[PDB]
Design a protein around this ligand. Structure first.
Ligand code: FPP
Ligand code: FPP
Ligand code: MG
Ligand code: MG
Lengths: 235, 235
């Protein structure tokens, strides 16, 4: 890797958990258990190579359509993840954050995530950002409702609204846009993830199912990214 | 092709014109001339197989950064395209439309496009939609400014705003979202194209440079699309 060109913000769509379990004739939830564990692997390497922000698509606003047993299992898994891994996150200087409508989560999940946020609030290393009950269209709807009230309450007109003003009212207002979006499993689509923020991101569609995605694969994606030629509409 | 599953709306990022000319040691504008001609090829096949909407990314809000000679050439090419091809568009029942901030175009280009719009306004076949001076972030900024005024002038609160209401205030309010987004040249990014509307589109990153993209290649992309398994967040 060119150590002077580590991306600041990698976003990942963690797809293929279900297929990983079905290849092994196991229930879909087993694939989610293993995908939860794989988050720990990827968090370690991203932190050790100096990525600043890692956003993971854990549960979309459309995933409520799935069987309740699967929704409940995914929504409970942060409790298991933090019980075993929070001490290492604190020691590695990682700061835990979320984006999405996290008030809809089980109360025990809200409590475990709030505890992890408070215990890492002053950490200055990798920001590990879980997008949970998150979707780009609903993010924009919410941000638009807030900008409408804010401008009216500040006695302002919509002439102030520009692309920059929108950036600063999104759930991702404190993060740069990702340079790199990775999706595993070989699907080629963004599925409502960060749709405003990925306007000029490089995309990598990695063929491994998420539970098989490991440190070496992350490094291979970064090396591919370092070969891309970004132009932002110019020459 | 499965004739019962022709996508209704294909969106295409027409990339690689510059590289096509540079491979031949020709100026970049020559590649744009040839890309203009290739639009005619693709319009014919899309219309003959029964695609309903074809949106082409002709000039982005970021492409103003490019050399003025190149911007002027691209902005003038619709005049040449319509002079030679408008009669065939009228006979093929195609309806010409645009999205973007088309008031910024040369006056002779505005006149030629307005003439083509008027002469095809009642056509019921393929909608051939040029995205010219178009970008998804600026589209959203403009739509947001309009929704803020509309709600205030109708004595409404922002509680009405939902994903549907946004769809109905975009430049693409009269089009379904594309099932398929194709980008030529092997770049893997969306570059501000239709960023709200492609939330669940299938992506195909075709390796041909745009002037080499032909009917056979379009049909191959549709056959790939017909093999994709779309899930919209569910199982
Ligand atoms: C700390 C924390 C957030 C833990 C929870 C992590 C976790 C298990 C997120 C689920 C991610 C998800 C919906 C993957 C999609 O694979 P898929 O089900 O679509 O797989 P398929 O396409 O092969 O069926
Ligand atoms: C009717 C009508 C709208 C005519 C005009 C069509 C036309 C020539 C559009 C230009 C499309 C464009 C900016 C392609 C990008 O290739 P690129 O310049 O980025 O190629 P490169 O990446 O290989 O340099
Ligand atoms: Mg999936
Ligand atoms: Mg290009």
């Amino acid at each position: 890797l060119d150590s002077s060109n580590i991306p600041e913000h990698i976003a990942i769509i963690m797809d293929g958990n279900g297929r990983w379990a079905k290849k092994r004739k196991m229930p879909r939830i087993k694939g989610h258990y293993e995908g939860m564990q794989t988050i720990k692997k990827i968090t370690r390497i991203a932190s050790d190579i100096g990525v600043k922000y890692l956003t993971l698509y854990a549960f979309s606003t459309e995933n409520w359509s799935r069987p309740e047993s699967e929704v409940n299992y995914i929504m409970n898994l942060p409790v298991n993840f933090l019980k075993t891994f929070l001490p290492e996150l604190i020691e590695k200087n990682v700061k835990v954050e979320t984006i999405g409508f996290t008030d809809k989560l089980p109360k025990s999940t809200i409590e475990a995530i709030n505890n992890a946020k408070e215990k890492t609030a002053n950490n200055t290393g990798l920001k590990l950002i879980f997008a949970i009950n998150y979707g780009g269209r609903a993010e924009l709807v919410h941000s638009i409702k807030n900008m409408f009230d804010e401008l009216h309450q500040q006695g302002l007109n919509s002439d102030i609204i520009d692309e920059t003003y929108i950036n600063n009212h999104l759930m991702t207002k404190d993060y740069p846009d990702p340079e790199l979006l990775i999706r595993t499993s070989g699907e080629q689509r963004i599925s409502n993830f960060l749709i405003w923020q990925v306007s000029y991101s490089e995309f990598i569609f990695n063929q491994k199912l998420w539970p098989d995605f490991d440190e070496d694969e992350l490094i291979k994606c970064i090396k591919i990214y370092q070969s891309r030629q970004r132009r932002f509409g110019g020459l």
